[PDB]
Every structure is written in C-alpha cells, then in structure tokens.
Design a binder for this molecule. Structure first.
Ligand SMILES: O=C1C=C(O)CCN1Cc1ccc(Cl)cc1-c1ccccc1
Length: 135
C-alpha cells in the first residue's frame, strides 16, 4: 500500500540555502564550524522498511544517520554534536522533526514542493530554508 512518506523516498542533493548561518548562530555554533558546515553540499538518502524510516546524510562536513518510527521519541546525535531527544511525525504530508536538548528546541520540517524536497529549520525567531533536488 501507499503511504505519505512515499514522496520523500530516494536520494537528494542540496541546491540552495537561505539563512543557514543565522540558524547555526542560534544553535551556538562557533565561527569555524559555521564556515565549514556552511560550505557543505549534503546528500540525503531517505528510505523506508515497514514502519521504520531511515534518513542518512552524507557530506564533507559530517555524516549522520537516523532510523525511527513516526511519533516515537529517539536519541539523536546531530551533526554539530548535540545530544538531543527527537520525534518525527507527519502533519498531513509534512515530516515534522523536533529536537529537544537542555531546555531548548528546534524544528525541522521537510515538504515536497514541485520536484524539490524543502527542509525548513527553525530555532527561536530564525527560519532557514534548504532546497534539495533529486540526485
Ligand atoms: O541535516 C542537515 C541538512 C541540512 O541541509 C542543514 C542542516 N542539517 C543538519 C545540521 C545542523 C547543524 C549544523 Cl552546524 C550542521 C548541519 C549539517 C550541515 C551540512 C551537512 C550536514 C549537516
């Protein structure tokens, strides 16, 4: 059967970025790591096996990999080495990824728009948009 996650499965590559440095400053990321991470052009591979979704990111900055079930909280080590409690849910056809640590929170939304996968990262008043195309 078909699922709302179907539209996300596959391999994706970063094509544009807006406000990422501001977002990283909200996370408390330092000057040198902002420079290095901001240069990266990540590729992401999204796949599904039964109820388990896997989101694997490979880049010249860091490589990350999470596997999860919608709605079930998990431990995640972010690219910038935060140790966070994460939950990913569907809100309609949008994957909503909330990361919580030290009393703080950031939300990452992934949506399909035209032939793109658009990742929005929000921390306090800062919104970053990261557009990916199929690789
Ligand atoms: O997974 C992603 C994918 C993006 O397009 C933007 C950011 N991150 C996570 C992330 C958070 C904080 C920091 Cl400092 C860096 C990243 C990042 C950047 C480039 C490659 C991989 C991860």
């Amino acid at each position: 059967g078909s699922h709302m996650c179907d539209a996300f499965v596959g391999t994706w590559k970063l094509v544009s970025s807006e406000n990422f440095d501001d977002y990283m400053k909200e996370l408390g990321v330092g000057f040198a790591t902002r420079k290095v991470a901001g240069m990266a052009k990540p590729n992401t591979i999204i796949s599904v096996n039964g109820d388990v979704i896997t989101l694997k990111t490979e880049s010249t900055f860091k490589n990350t990999e999470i596997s999860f079930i919608l709605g079930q909280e998990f431990d995640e080590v972010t690219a910038d080495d935060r140790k966070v409690k994460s939950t990913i849910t569907l809100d309609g056809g949008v994957l909503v990824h909330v990361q919580k640590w030290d009393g703080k929170s950031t939300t990452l939304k992934r949506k399909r728009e035209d032939d793109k996968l658009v990742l929005e990262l929000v921390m306090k008043g800062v919104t970053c948009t990261r557009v990916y195309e199929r690789a």
